[PDB]
Structure formats: structure tokens, C-alpha cells
Design a protein around this ligand. Structure first.
Ligand SMILES: Nc1ncnc2c1ncn2[C@@H]1O[C@H](COP(=O)(O)OP(=O)(O)OP(=O)(O)O)[C@@H](O)[C@H]1O
Ligand SMILES: Nc1ncnc2c1ncn2[C@@H]1O[C@H](COP(=O)(O)OP(=O)(O)OP(=O)(O)O)[C@@H](O)[C@H]1O
Ligand SMILES: Nc1ncnc2c1ncn2[C@@H]1O[C@H](COP(=O)(O)OP(=O)(O)OP(=O)(O)O)[C@@H](O)[C@H]1O
Ligand SMILES: [Ca+2]
Ligand SMILES: [Ca+2]
Ligand SMILES: [Ca+2]
Ligand SMILES: [Ca+2]
Ligand SMILES: [Ca+2]
Ligand SMILES: [Ca+2]
Lengths: 311, 16, 311, 16, 311, 16
DNA sequence: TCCTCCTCCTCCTCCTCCTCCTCCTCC
DNA sequence: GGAGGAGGAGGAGGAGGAGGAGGAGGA
């Protein structure tokens, strides 16, 4: 796991500074190591002398140098892939939703974005034997569409204590774009204590369409969104959780591309495009991925969560 | 803030 | 190859100073020769008297004067051009990715930037007979999208020991813009020992969009990026490797120009603009080059790396 | 730093 | 031509002093005549007594007094104007690139700055009948973008021995700003022996963006650039060559002004602003000139060098 | 320094 | 089987050398 | 033949850099 920031005091850092760091969001040694010198300067009780000391000491505790692809292929083969509750869909993702990375699921309305997030919020607690993550879930919701009764329906499918599953889902309703980012700083604190295995922001860009209106606020909208997506990438490296954000769509009138622009297209590693099939069937499609080939699968929304096409 | 139950650590979901 | 800095002691330089130089990034006689007098002064245990001695002695070991275009056309005709794994694409580049220079590959998401870097990281190890570089690869990755399983898929195509190919790729994950530059100083050390033939920074400008936010930090962003691109140009001259950086894009709302501004447009010698074709086909295009004509080619991403349009 | 395998010198990739 | 400095010994100067002058950059009587008394004092083995003698004797050998505009209009009408390889472009410059003066070509990337310098480096060897300079070329390159294969392509157009043309281009790669200036002292030596007709520094200000970082080094950056541009102006008067420097651009964020500031705007006599036209066409524009009117022309980059819009 | 060919004097480029 | 319009955003530091000057009294 | 005394008085500015960021179906 990640080393807590308290281990910096044992290396020659004033316990007052650690408190000044922990008031800035940093809670692990990694979070301070990965941080630039610029960020630590922006802290009040920190100067360029301290920041150079903090960065130097923290760098000794976490590897930040070169290795070999062999040593990386080894460490990567032991990465957790959470099942989506669909044999047909996991065969598309070659295992399931991959941890330590940002995954994006966009599509028109009803295409099952929120439904996949509810299934993931349950199956991330199964033992790895059964294809899960053996951890809690963190469901940031910017729409008011978090339904606990949909988590119970999936727990019944996998035979889990519905009362116990709802204890492992830390729910938080974001009301604007500033609050949505504030919830991530509090999120970095919780993941140090417990063991969360899945972070869900649904929808990640819902509140950016309205808080930032026209083109006159376009530049500020993407720069604020870029910091959010960057702060998610930091959580994926600090704790090795799985970040699964959902995205809305927009028509092109010159036939539905996702919003967020190039800021969210480059940041996310895996993009899933969900269409409407027939009846209760849907069609997921590897829109972008570093490793997976471009292909389509057909899942469906059933009364017990996301599952294979029951037909 | 944090809920008095959200601060609680993970629990392996018992079977049923 | 490049002469190691230890050859300065045999010319009247205190072995203590060489240690004070090697603690500043310089590891070859070239790195000290190409360096300005200003940089050596900025070192602590070095004064204007020593620096004038160091520059004078080092200049005797490496040619830094005029020649003729005839002597340069001869020396250039023996330059290595790494194949891209696509006959149609190499015919566009008139040989392949040229060493001793900075090449840039920009485009929207999914356009195969990371995929080309994975193919290059493999084909740079083929013997020159087969169109490679007969050297190791160095893959600095600022996004977390380095997949070793994509290197094995390309090794199977060219019939190479997949276990041996992954031993020749020195991978390093940069977490911010300061760390991204720090990795280049450590990079100059490794290239003295082994024989690297390809340096890859993907993405070179990913972390500059978020570490430096608005326009208020624009000036500092480009000056920090200019030093990075300059430090790459130094590696291309020290060791004659091939620098292949990738770049993100941005929309112009006044229809996708690359980011980085004029700082990265002037610095890079070859720019490749990658579009999305149809299905799995992509369209590369000589955006800028000193010698190559403006033209387009059509490659594709296949299950065995980048290859010709398998259609 | 440097990996114990990154410091190793180049190896001509054997065929397969 | 210019008188060599050896003619000072025949006028009562110690042949030891001439050796002490030639070790300071001066190789012609002009270079010593145009020099201030301050520069000769800064030489070690030279005192105020000698310097007054050196300046007095040298002034007798070269005219440094008043004349008439009639005698100057006569001497100017016999000045050489090198063709740019484009009838449409030469009609803009009213003859071509004018010798005995500093010409600047700035613009965004790909706008054909390096391409014009390659065409000029060839057409400066044509006989004056065909519009050239009947001399060698000197191509100082601070970017690594000197391609001899682009000189051969232009020699084929004008029907010249491609092997002979590459013998008349003295190429030198500058690696920093100190080295860039050092190459000019060695340049003054070569021009005394042979007959160079064109000096090219491309890019003249590329290395000044990175060697001198922020505003804290701004003053030192321009004073170092002012000496360089002044040392070029001296070569244009000593030998009557044609100095053609290229310049990068920078955006103004308050839409692309050239870098270098007022130091390079006043120093250069002719400034050419190169835009991107359509396809392979470009648009040059008299940005500043003492005589030429403000106007635009349209040239293009062809497989045989810079030429008229082949459309 | 100077190349053994850069020190050579100018040559009128012969036709071809 | 066709069709079109929209806008705003700030921050950045470092830089050294310089010379000449004169009159005065008593025991 | 004898016997040293007394400081004054400031000048004089240079030198620009560096772009970002798409949205929105109609009938
Ligand atoms: N318990 C259930 N059993 C079966 N189908 C259900 C159930 N609950 C919801 N659905 C179906 O799933 C779809 C809703 O999907 P979901 O809530 O994921 O939408 P979404 O993609 O998040 O949409 P939006 O952009 O509006 O938020 C609808 O077709 C709905 O009828
Ligand atoms: N093994 C594979 N076989 C076939 N296609 C693949 C494979 N792996 C990835 N792809 C495809 O290649 C593309 C991904 O390209 P790549 O990873 O180079 O993106 P990129 O240009 O780096 O994007 P970004 O800016 O998001 O990082 C997608 O179309 C994906 O479907
Ligand atoms: N042989 C050729 N035939 C046709 N077009 C060419 C040829 N070589 C280069 N070009 C084109 O000329 C342009 C390159 O111009 P050039 O090398 O002068 O750039 P530049 O202005 O010096 O740029 P930078 O600031 O990046 O150095 C590109 O559009 C390139 O496609
Ligand atoms: Ca929803
Ligand atoms: Ca992406
Ligand atoms: Ca990528
Ligand atoms: Ca360029
Ligand atoms: Ca150029
Ligand atoms: Ca001018």
C-alpha cells in the first residue's frame, strides 16, 4: 500500500510542516513525491529551502527512477481487473475494468452509464478469486441518480449481505464544480485509512456544462476540468484504485461526440462508447485504449444489475 | 465532512 | 561513440572537478564542449578560471569549427533511419525515423501516437540490415500508458525473443514537469554506458497543461518547456539517438492545432500529424520537415503493432 | 536511480 | 576586395603587433580602421601609444571621410543582388537579396525560412549574369537542420555540378550562444583567403531563448545579442557579403511578433515576414526596409528549392 | 579549426 | 434533404565601473 | 640653524517574453 505522510517525520521533517502539508491535500509520501516543487512553494508555511528538503527526503522513500520493461511487465501482470458483471463485456476488456488508470464511459441517455457504475460499485468488493477488488467503493455523484436499491439488486445476484455491501460505498453528492474538486481532497484522506478499490465520478462533466456557460468561459472551463482529471490521475497512482468516470454527449450539427473536448480525450486511457441496442440490450465499444483492440460487445441491463444479454 | 460510518474501514462482504 | 568525461583528467583537469561536473549532468566531453561558459560558472566549485580551462581543453577533443557541405553530406549519408514498421509510412519519411534529431507526432486521441512509440521501441533493436538501430530504447512516459504487452506483440512479428526485447527498454514514469526534466539528467548517464538508439517522451507536453494553469503562468510554462526541448537536442548531439516526442492537441475556437506554441514548433525538426482514417486506418502527414515534402501516407494499427493498411 | 537490469548493457534480440 | 592586415607592416607597425591584432579577430586593414580606440586598448600587448599609431596608419589606407551622394549613388549602383530563385519574389525585393547589409527572415514554423537559406546558399554561386554572387557560401546553423540534399536539388535546377556546389558551402554547427559568436571570428579569417558572397545564420536567435532564461537574464541576453549583430555588420562592411539571418516568432497574448526585441529590429535593414499560404505556397512581405515599399509576394517551396508558385 | 577543403578557394560551379 | 452561429483569460528581474587636484614664514 | 601644515569632490540607465480552449439538433 501507500506509505502515510507521517513517515516523513522519521526522516528529518518538522512535524509542524507535515501538518502544513496535510492541510494542503497531501496524505501519503507518494503524494508529496509526485508533487512538483511549485505546489509545495504555494503553501504558506513552506519555503524553497523546506520544499527542496521535503522533495529530497520523500524521493528516497519511493522509486522515481528508470527500470526495465521486464520489471514493469512483471509488476503489471499482478494488477487487479474488476469484473463488470458481464462475461461478454469482460471478454471485450480482456479481464475487466483495470485499476490504476482512468476509464471513461460516455453515451446518450439511458445507455446504462449509471447502471454500470452501480454494478462496479458492488463487484469491486468480491474477492479477487471471483474477479473483484476486495475493497470499498467511492461513488461521487453529480446528478442525484445514486440508487442504493440498485446495489442491493446486484448483491443478491452475487450472494452478498446487502446490508454489508452498502457499508462499503462512500457516497457523496457534488453540487457544483468547485465542490466536485473539494470532494477529491477529502477522498485522498479516506483512502489512507480504509482500502478503497474503485473511484466513480458520475457524471464527471455534468456540472461543467452549466457552471461555465458560453465560449467566453470556455478556457476557464477546460483548465478547471484539467486540474480535476489530473487530481484523479494522482489518486490512481497514490492508491492504485480504479477511476471510472462517465461523460455526457453532444450533437455535431455540421453524430454524437462526447463533451469535454481534447482535455478529457487525452487524459482518459480507456473510453467506452455505449449505444442503445434493442429492448434492454446495449452495445459497448472500445472507443480508445492503449492495449485493447477496437471492438464491440453486447451487454444488457437486467433487474439484477448489468449482465449478459439474457436472450 | 465524513460520516461516522464512512470513516469505518473496509469489511469483506459476508455471504448470505 | 561519445567520449566519456574521464578523458578530461588526462588533459590537465582536476579529477575533483570532473566529479563536480558529473554532479551537474555532464558525462561526456561533448556535453562539456557544447556547454556555454555561463553553465559551468553556475557550478559551485567552478570559477571563471577553471571554466575557461575546461572549455579550452574540451574543445581540443571534439571538432567545433567549420567544414564543407561535402564532408557533411558524406557524414550524413551514414546516418541511421529507424523503420516505423510500415512500408507505406517509411516511404513517406524516406527511410524512417531519423536519428540525431527531434521528431514530433501530434494528433487527436486514439490517432496512434502511443502505438507508434511502442513499435519504434521494438524496431529500434533490429539489426541495421532489417532497418533498425541496433540499440536499446528509453521510454519516458508521462501518462501511464506504457503497455509491455504491446512490445511483445511487435517482437512476435519481427521474430525476436520477447523476453530479450523487454530487457532493452528502459522505462520511466514521469509524474510532473520537474520530474520529467530530472529524468533527462539520469538519462545522459545511462547512454554513456549502454548504447541507446531511441529516446521517447510520450507525452512531452502532457504535464505542462496542468502544472502551469492559466495565462498568468504562461511565460514560465514555455521557458520551462524550452529548457526541456533544449536538453533533448543536447542528447541528440551527444549520443546521436533519435528523439521522438508526442504532443497533444487543442481546438481553435475562432480546427486542431498542436499545443506547446512556437516553442515546440521551432524546436522540433520533423512534425507528423496523425488523423483518424476509417476503422483501424490512420493518416500520417508531414506537417513540417527540413527535407521531406509535404505529403500524406496511410498506415494502420494492427494486433502486431503499427503496420501497413491490412486491407 | 537505476534498475539492476537497466544498467545492463545492450543485448542483440535473439530470434524465435 | 579588402586589404589584408599584412599591409600594416609596410607602414611602420611591428610585425609582432600584427600578430597580436590577428589574435584578436582583426584580419583586414578595414577591421582595424573601423575598430574603436577602445577595442585596441583591450588587447594585452597594445598600449594607447600603439593604438593611436595603428589607427592613424590604417586610416590612411581606407577612406573614412565625407563624400557626395553622387559618388555614393554611383558606387551603390554596382552592388550585387543575389536572386532568391523566384521571379515573383525578386520583383518584390527589386533585384534580390542585397549584399553589404543584414537581411532578416522571420515567421512561424514551416514558413520556408531554412528553405530560402538553402536556395540562397546555391544561387549565390551563379555568375552575376544569371543573378548570383560568384562566391562561396557560409552557412552557420544553430538548429541542426542543414540538409545538403536540398542544395543538390537546387543545383540540378540551375544545372550545376552538385559535387562542385557542395564544395563552396562552409558549414558550421553552433551549439550555444558563445560558440555562435566564436564562429564569426573564425569566419573573418576565411573570408580573407577565399571569396565568400553570402553569410547565413539560421537561426540567429534560436539559442538565445534557452541560454538566457527569464527576465532576470534579459539585459545580458540582448547585450550579448547586440554584439553578435554588430559583429555581423562588420563582416558586411569588411567583405561586402550578404548577411541573411533567420528569426523565430513569439505570440503576443494581450498575433505573432518576432523575437529579439528592439535590438534585432533596429540592427537589421531588411525584414521579411513569411506566412503560410495554401498547400505549398507561402507569402513573403516586406516588413521593414529603407528603400523597398511595403508589399507582399507569393512564392512556394518546390522539390527543386524555392521557386515561383508552380500553379 | 578549418577543414582541408574549407580552406580551398572558390571554384566557379561547372555546368552539367 | 437540407440548414450556423457564438469570447473571453496575466503574470514574469537582474545588471558596475569611473581621478585628478598646492599653496603657505618667520625667529 | 631651526621648524611642518592642511582635504575636496559624484556620475550614469539597460532590456521583452509567452498562447489557451469547443459548443449545440432541427423538421
Ligand atoms: N431495475 C432496472 N431494471 C431494468 N432496467 C432498468 C432498471 N433501472 C433502470 N433500468 C434501465 O436502464 C436505463 C437507465 O440507465 P442509466 O441510469 O445508467 O442511464 P444513464 O446512461 O446514466 O443516463 P443519463 O445520462 O440520463 O444519466 C433505462 O433504459 C432504464 O429503463
Ligand atoms: N492491440 C491493439 N490492436 C488493435 N488496435 C489497438 C490495439 N491497442 C490499441 N489499439 C487502438 O489504437 C488506438 C489507441 O492509440 P494510442 O494508444 O496510440 O493513442 P494516443 O494517440 O496515444 O492517445 P491519447 O492522446 O489518448 O494518449 C485506439 O484506436 C485503440 O483501439
Ligand atoms: N524537398 C521538399 N519538397 C517540398 N517541400 C519541402 C521539402 N523539404 C521541405 N519542404 C517543406 O518546407 C517546409 C519546411 O520549411 P523550413 O525547413 O524552411 O522551415 P523553417 O521555417 O526553418 O522552420 P523551423 O522554425 O521549424 O526551423 C515544410 O512545409 C516542408 O513540408
Ligand atoms: Ca446518469
Ligand atoms: Ca486517451
Ligand atoms: Ca498516449
Ligand atoms: Ca520545426
Ligand atoms: Ca529552420
Ligand atoms: Ca531595421
Amino acid at each position: 500500500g501507500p506509505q502515510p505522510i507521517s513517515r516523513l517525520e522519521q526522516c528529518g521533517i518538522n512535524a509542524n510542516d507535515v501538518k502544513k502539508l496535510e492541510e494542503a491535500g497531501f496524505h501519503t509520501v507518494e503524494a508529496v513525491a509526485y508533487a512538483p516543487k511549485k505546489e509545495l512553494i504555494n503553501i504558506k508555511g513552506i519555503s524553497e529551502a523546506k520544499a527542496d528538503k521535503i522533495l529530497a527526503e520523500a524521493a528516497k522513500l519511493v522509486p522515481m527512477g528508470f527500470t526495465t520493461a521486464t520489471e514493469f511487465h512483471q509488476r503489471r501482470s499482478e494488477i487487479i481487473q474488476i469484473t463488470t458483471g458481464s462475461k461478454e463485456l469482460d471478454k471485450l476488456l480482456q479481464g475487466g475494468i483495470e485499476t490504476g488508470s482512468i476509464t471513461e464511459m460516455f453515451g446518450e441517455f439511458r445507455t446504462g452509464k449509471t447502471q454500470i457504475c452501480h454494478t462496479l460499485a458492488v463487484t469491486c468488493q468480491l474477492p479477487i478469486d471471483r474477479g473483484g477488488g476486495e475493497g470499498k467503493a467511492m461513488y461521487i455523484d453529480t446528478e442525484g441518480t445514486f440508487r442504493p436499491e440498485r446495489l442491493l439488486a446486484v448483491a443478491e445476484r452475487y450472494g452478498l449481505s446487502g446490508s454489508d455491501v452498502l457499508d462499503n460505498v462512500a457516497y457523496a453528492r457534488a453540487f457544483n464544480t468547485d465542490h466536485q474538486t473539494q470532494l477529491l481532497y477529502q477522498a485522498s484522506a479516506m483512502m489512507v485509512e480504509s482500502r478503497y478499490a474503485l473511484l466513480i465520478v458520475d457524471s464527471a462533466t455534468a456540472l461543467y456544462r452549466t457552471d461555465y456557460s458560453g465560449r467566453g468561459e470556455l478556457s476557464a472551463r477546460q483548465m478547471h476540468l484539467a486540474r480535476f482529471l489530473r487530481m484523479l490521475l494522482r489518486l490512481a497512482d497514490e492508491f492504485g484504485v480504479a477511476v471510472v468516470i462517465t461523460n455526457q454527449v453532444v450533437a455535431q450539427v455540421d453524430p454524437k461526440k462526447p463533451i469535454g473536448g481534447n482535455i478529457i480525450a487525452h487524459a482518459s486511457t480507456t473510453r467506452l462508447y455505449l449505444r442503445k441496442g434493442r429492448g434492454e440490450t446495449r452495445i459497448c465499444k472500445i472507443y480508445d485504449s492503449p492495449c485493447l483492440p477496437e471492438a464491440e460487445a453486447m451487454f444488457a441491463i437486467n433487474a439484477d444489475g448489468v449482465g449478459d444479454a439474457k436472450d | 465532512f465524513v460520516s461516522p460510518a464512512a470513516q469505518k474501514a473496509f469489511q469483506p462482504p459476508r455471504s448470505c
